[PDB]
Design brief:
The structure is cut from a larger assembly and holds chains A (192 residues), B (170 residues) and C (49 residues).
Chain A: H1 45-69, H2 75-81, H3 87-96, H4 98-123, H5 143-173, H6 178-182
Helix pairs in contact in A: 1-5
Chain B: H1 30-33, H2 36-62, H3 73-83, H4 85-108, H5 128-158, H6 163-168
Helix pairs in contact in B: 2-5
Chain C: H1 14-26
The chains are: A mainly alpha (192), B mainly alpha (170), C mainly alpha (49).
The structure holds chlorophyll A (CLA) (6 copies), the ligand CC1=C(C#C/C(C)=C/C=C/C(C)=C/C=C/C=C(C)/C=C/C=C(\C)C#CC2=C(C)C[C@@H](O)CC2(C)C)C(C)(C)C[C@H](O)C1 (4 copies) and ligand IHT (2 copies).
């Protein structure tokens, strides 16, 4: 574990002075020992991290998503969707079917890849939770490069999930898309 | 241990690797639930249907028989369900499929190989090595034609353009 | 072979035979192919697979 006992691991404690959960020992990556509401006892940390990792992945795609969709609309998509972003885009996309095709293909991936893998992991398998083998670029040969990498995938991905939320919530109460939102800092001058 | 086709998934047990075109691809795992020989026969039969269908789709577009009127492939089924021919074709397919049932009963008792009917009328793949390569080529081409026939027909519905036409003008 | 051949017969009765032929529609051999994997269905299917 990258920097075990330093950045992750037993010695660390997010809520120090509070005991590290009973089921939160060292091996799981991204374990600073933070399960305040004690889900660890009731949940399968396996499913848990399948979820965390999966979420963080779809959340990164999604965050970058929104940020880029506000700089460069693909022109064909742009013309069909009329410069509509985030919430409404989903509504209009869901019409052109863009969002319908995406649903079919991601669900097919899930039924082919996701569902079966989880079933195996929970039964018990060599595969780690979230361990699809996907690196065409086998970018990290080293186990060590890869530990730093897993920690970074979890954490970059958590900023991801917190921010996709911010993006969306801000968009509901204030009109602007995320690139737009920072500009026009106050955002209450115009509900846009 | 782990299927080469799906590395994160484990190798499906019944798919040892003896059958042609077996890359351990069975994510949902039907082989574990049913006889692999029956599934192999279904694969070969559907795929042979699809290979013939994919060829005929194009051969009809380039050339429709003069005694019959000229209709795009999909528009023809509705024509011949009345012309009469449709019945003749589906009739003969049923006739051959009754002996297909008999062959399936042989298959259940292990007296016949899956997707095998001793059809090498011209002794093409009579070499052991070749029959293997041909068996691999047959299963791939079948697996491809399964996709191709569906595309051809579904494209016609969404776009009234016999494939050759559509490809010509998108 | 053997020119005229008469094959002695001691099998099922004629009534039983026509009942077998009736069995083609009453219980054909088609769907039994799709019964589950009959050796052991992987009763010891390893949890990993
Ligand atoms: C959660 C993920 C997610 C979801 C739900 C959507 C949904 C949508 N995107 Mg996409 N998008 C995503 C991630 C996502 N995007 C990411 C990560 C990027 C950054 C590259 C983009 C960049 C992007 C652009 C530039 C555009 C869209 C557009 C759209 C809309 C039509 C589909 C399309 O053109 O796809 C195209 C998406 C891609 C080619 C990105 C593929 C990314 C994966 C990871 C590979 C639809 C609302 C179009 C639209 O109508 O906008 C106005 C459009 O112009 N998206
Ligand atoms: C439409 C088909 C489909 C199917 C069959 C599944 C299947 C599954 N998803 Mg879901 N999922 C889908 C689409 C689908 N997903 C899509 C389109 C997204 C966003 C792109 C997600 C995002 C998602 C996340 C983030 C998670 C799941 C999870 C799950 C699992 C429990 C539900 C299961 C493997 C959970 C999982 O696998 O972790 C436990 C989970 O946490 N899914
Ligand atoms: C910057 C963030 C980030 C980081 C540090 C990593 C890090 C990693 N990813 Mg990646 N990954 C990311 C974003 C990231 N990923 C995103 C947004 C997606 C969604 C498209 C994925 C989807 C993904 C898959 C599907 C897989 C990885 C895998 C990996 C590992 C090999 C590279 C490594 C731990 C591989 C893995 O889990 O190996 C253990 C793997 O198979 N990642
Ligand atoms: C895969 C199944 C399949 C199905 C359901 C049909 C169905 C049809 N084909 Mg045929 N066709 C097939 C395969 C198939 N074809 C193949 C493999 C070829 C390539 C030789 C053709 C070439 C072909 C032509 C050139 C024509 C048809 C036509 C027809 C129609 C009348 C039958 C006929 O004349 O067949 C004759 C076909 C054969 C004797 C070849 C099949 C032999 C293999 C062993 C089966 C009907 C809609 C006619 C049509 O559409 O008229 C409007 C027509 O003109 N088909
Ligand atoms: C996958 C292919 C397919 C599908 C979905 C159907 C579907 C149908 N057929 Mg069939 N049919 C097929 C292939 C198919 N047929 C073939 C290859 C032939 C040989 C030409 C026929 C000949 C045929 C006839 C002659 C008739 C049908 C009829 C019907 C009906 C139903 C919609 C009947 C119909 O249209 O009335 C309901 C009918 O009379 N079909
Ligand atoms: C190009 C595709 C292709 C290939 C590689 C094969 C290969 C094979 N088929 Mg054939 N087969 C094909 C198309 C093909 N088939 C089609 C379209 C049908 C449906 C009409 C069938 C229906 C069929 C049956 C019912 C049987 C075979 C059998 C066989 C095997 C022995 C006969 C032989 O030597 O064929 C060699 C094939 C070729 C050299 C391809 C000819 C290419 C032309 C130009 C098209 C062999 C593995 C027999 C078997 O299973 O024996 C083990 C058998 O009983 N095939
Ligand atoms: C991380 C992760 C996951 C995931 C995920 C996610 C979130 C994935 C997101 C994927 C994305 C955003 C995919 C976008 C694809 C877009 C395509 C192919 C566009 C096609 C456009 C066409 C054909 C067009 C057009 C046009 C036409 C016809 C008409 C013209 O007038 C207009 C126009 C030119 C526009 C899952 C959930 C599976 C879990 C897994 O654990 C891993
Ligand atoms: C795995 C793998 C590979 C790979 C790969 C891939 C596909 C990698 C993809 C990585 C991605 C998509 C990463 C995205 C991270 C996004 C984050 C952290 C977002 C943060 C948002 C924040 C802080 C915010 C915000 C905001 C909010 C809320 C409101 C806004 O108004 C303002 C603001 C914008 C500030 C490859 C093949 C290359 C190699 C390897 O062989 C295998
Ligand atoms: C993901 C997944 C899997 C899978 C899978 C997949 C992708 C399965 C796909 C299956 C497909 C695509 C099957 C297609 C069959 C097509 C046939 C029989 C066509 C017949 C045409 C005829 C008779 C005709 C005709 C005609 C013609 C040509 C001429 C016209 O004038 C007339 C007419 C219209 C009548 C596996 C296997 C691993 C399992 C796993 O757990 C999950
Ligand atoms: C003679 C003989 C024998 C025999 C035999 C026979 C009769 C053999 C017949 C074999 C045939 C007809 C095989 C056909 C294969 C077709 C394929 C793979 C097509 C793929 C198309 C694709 C992917 C596509 C597409 C497309 C789509 C979907 C959409 C389009 O917009 C675009 C595009 C066009 C690109 C046997 C072996 C039985 C034994 C005997 O001893 C000797
Ligand atoms: C597409 C679509 C829609 C939609 C939508 C979407 C995309 C909705 C997305 C919603 C999401 C991603 C919500 C996230 C909320 C996150 C929160 C509150 C996190 C709080 C974290 C905290 C307090 C952390 C605190 C902490 C901190 C900082 C320090 C450490 C301790 C810790 C406790 C961890 C609709 C609904 C508009 C409908 C439309 O027709 C179609
Ligand atoms: C209705 C009707 C008729 C009819 C009819 C007929 C003849 C209908 C025939 C329909 C067919 C053959 C449809 C095939 C669909 C195939 C699909 C979706 C495959 C997807 C594969 C994928 C995504 C593969 C994915 C993949 C996998 C798993 C592994 C590798 C990676 C990857 C490639 C990504 C008529 C014309 C007779 C008229 C009549 O009145 C009634």
């Amino acid at each position: 574990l990258y920097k075990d006992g330093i950045i992750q691991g037993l010695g660390v404690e997010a809520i120090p002075g509070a005991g590290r959960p009973a089921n939160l020992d060292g091996t799981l990556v991204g374990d600073v020992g933070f399960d305040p509401l004690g889900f660890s006892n009731w949940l399968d940390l396996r499913w848990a991290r399948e979820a965390e990792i999966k979420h963080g992945r779809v959340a990164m795609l999604a965050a970058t998503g929104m940020i880029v969709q506000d700089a460069y609309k693909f022109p064909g998509f742009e013309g069909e969707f009329g410069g509509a972003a985030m919430m409404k885009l989903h509504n209009l996309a869901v019409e052109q079917g863009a969002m319908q095709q995406l649903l079919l293909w991601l669900g097919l991936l899930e039924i082919i890849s996701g569902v079966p893998a989880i079933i195996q992991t929970l039964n018990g398998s060599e595969r780690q939770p979230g361990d699809f083998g996907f690196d065409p670029l086998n970018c990290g040969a080293n186990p060590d490069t890869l530990a730093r990498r897993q920690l970074t995938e979890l954490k970059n991905g958590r900023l991801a999930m917190i921010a996709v939320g911010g993006m969306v919530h801000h968009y509901l109460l204030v009109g602007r898309g995320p690139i737009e939102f920072i500009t026009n800092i106050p955002n209450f001058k115009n509900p846009l | 241990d782990f299927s080469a086709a799906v590395p994160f998934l484990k190798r499906p047990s019944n798919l040892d690797g003896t059958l042609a075109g077996d890359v351990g691809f069975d994510p949902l795992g039907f082989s574990d639930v049913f006889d692999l020989r029956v599934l192999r026969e279904a694969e070969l039969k559907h795929g042979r249907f699809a290979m013939l269908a994919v060829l005929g789709f194009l051969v009809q577009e380039v050339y429709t028989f003069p005694f019959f009127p000229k209709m795009a492939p999909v528009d023809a089924h509705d024509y011949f369900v009345t012309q009469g021919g449709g019945s003749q074709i589906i009739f003969w397919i049923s006739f051959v499929e009754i002996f297909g049932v008999v062959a399936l009963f042989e298959l259940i008792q292990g007296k016949r190989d899956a997707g095998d009917f001793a059809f090498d009328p011209l002794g093409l793949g009579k070499d052991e090595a070749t029959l293997a390569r041909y068996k691999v080529a047959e299963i791939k081409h079948a697996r491809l034609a399964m996709i191709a026939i569906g595309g051809f027909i579904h494209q016609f519905w969404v776009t009234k353009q016999t494939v050759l036409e559509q490809l010509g003008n998108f | 072979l053997y020119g005229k051949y008469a094959p002695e017969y001691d099998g099922p009765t004629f009534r039983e035979g026509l009942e077998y032929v009736l069995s083609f529609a009453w219980k054909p051999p088609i769907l039994i192919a799709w019964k589950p994997r009959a050796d052991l269905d992987r009763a010891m299917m390893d949890p990993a697979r």
